[PDB]
Design a protein around this ligand. Structure first.
Ligand SMILES: Nc1ncnc2c1ncn2[C@@H]1O[C@H](CSCC[C@H](N)C(=O)O)[C@@H](O)[C@H]1O
Lengths: 265, 265
């Protein structure tokens, strides 16, 4: 009669909360999805070993089209868990699944976990200064989406930071790198000429948040565009004007050039 | 030779990540602060029991004025942890403590935990649509803070949602309720008269996120301003223009008036 939405956290199998782990262990059935994002620091096998239960992986179609036929029937008569990377319901489509549960007469509860949305706090940028967020999507064929560029423009215009989620082909386990994202933005700039993203733009790269050894780097596009930030996932941030405290953290912790202390504050 | 900043999560001792717990258990010394937020579902005793170590609680003064005298000295020759509610670097000034660690020759690492900043996803509002955030502070003396009102105005004009952290006076055991926040906002409205926050404004209240049964309510200020949302902590949200799916969730899960289903495109 109960369905638990449980977040797995940021990077590896230990990023699930103690609460999430203990609940998952007591569930009769455990499902999971790895299409909204991936857990780059672990494997399905290691997650299963930790929970001590077999985990049935569900595809985007399994969930979006058949959640009520695959998960809910069992949840109607058993304790069922649905694991998701990060924090449950951060992904836009997940919230609606709680309505499906209600419709099916199944109670649902949410067990939170760390999300990259809040983990960016490790960049030293004040969380309250982050504005609207966006996703940089790989262009393909004759389709060249650029709305994320406008998001940066609108946030920066108001002195706000912009969190940019990078494209991920979960199924093929292919991650867009911060370098590729920078190249794309420069490409968009060359087309819109809005003066939003150039070689002189200050950016922050956060790779493998959740790991004990994440890569946190800050600097100008011209210098970071070909830098190796390590293994994915990568997150790109275009900060707005900086509070001196933010700038000093970027210099001391993220290796930012001293120049930001006078140019970006 | 190391200092770990470890988040404890939203509501109780089990909201810590497994990673955080396993590291905390092996630390030589464990410190913590409980003034940045309120964990309404646990006690110091229960936290100490789970970690299996004595925890020295620090006051805001101990941290802000003497972190480098109380914590860092021991971190030079031992493995030390500093625990905080939620995520240690979200809506706190703790990021700066990493700079103090560096100058003291102490390596620091961050272990994230669920944060209210991302937990708001449980309200059904799309996380990417949240704009700049703000804090509703208790007026004191002749000083009546109002900057949060302008944040709401700015986000709303862009169609973005506004997350409002609520004030907390840990030493006085005072935790601002959503009701008190709405009352303060109505007063600022009368002063500035910008048509930003009135009795007809739709708001969302999330109380005790992290618990299994948090209070999630949506409705007009005139109807919710005197409603009992249960024990603190509380957070208030002022949505911008809603997507149809957001409205459906607010109606089905947060008990909002079904009239909001009729979005004005
Ligand atoms: N479980 C919870 N439910 C509702 N609001 C919460 C909450 N935890 C924190 N808050 C809100 O956030 C304020 C503290 S701000 C510090 C937040 C913390 N670092 C985090 O990551 O969550 C509180 O006064 C309250 O308004």
């Amino acid at each position: 009669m109960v369905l638990y939405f449980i977040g797995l956290g940021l990077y590896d199998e230990r990023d699930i909360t103690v609460k999430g782990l203990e609940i998952a262990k007591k569930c009769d059935y455990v499902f999971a999805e790895f299409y909204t994002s991936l857990m780059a620091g672990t494997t399905l096998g290691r997650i299963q070993k930790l929970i001590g239960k077999e985990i049935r992986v569900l595809s985007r179609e399994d969930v979006e089209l058949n959640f009520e036929n695959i998960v809910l029937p069992l949840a109607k008569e058993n304790e069922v868990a649905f694991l998701t990377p990060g924090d449950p319901l951060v992904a836009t489509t997940h919230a609606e699944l709680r309505i499906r549960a209600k419709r099916a007469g199944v109670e649902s509860y949410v067990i939170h976990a760390p999300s990259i949305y809040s983990a960016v706090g490790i960049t030293g940028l004040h969380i309250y200064k982050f504005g609207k967020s966006a996703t940089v999507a790989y262009p393909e064929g004759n389709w060249f989406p650029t709305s994320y560029y406008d998001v940066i423009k609108e946030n920066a215009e108001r002195g706000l930071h912009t969190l940019l989620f990078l494209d991920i082909k979960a199924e093929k386990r292919m991650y867009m790198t911060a370098n590729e994202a920078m190249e794309l933005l420069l490409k968009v700039e060359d087309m819109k000429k809005g003066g939003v993203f150039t070689d002189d733009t200050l950016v922050v790269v956060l790779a493998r948040a959740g790991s004990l050894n994440p890569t946190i780097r800050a600097g100008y596009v011209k210098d970071l565009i070909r830098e190796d930030f390590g293994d994915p996932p990568h997150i790109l941030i275009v900060p707005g004007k900086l509070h001196i405290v933010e700038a000093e953290y970027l210099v001391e912790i993220a290796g930012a050039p001293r120049e930001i202390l006078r140019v970006n504050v």
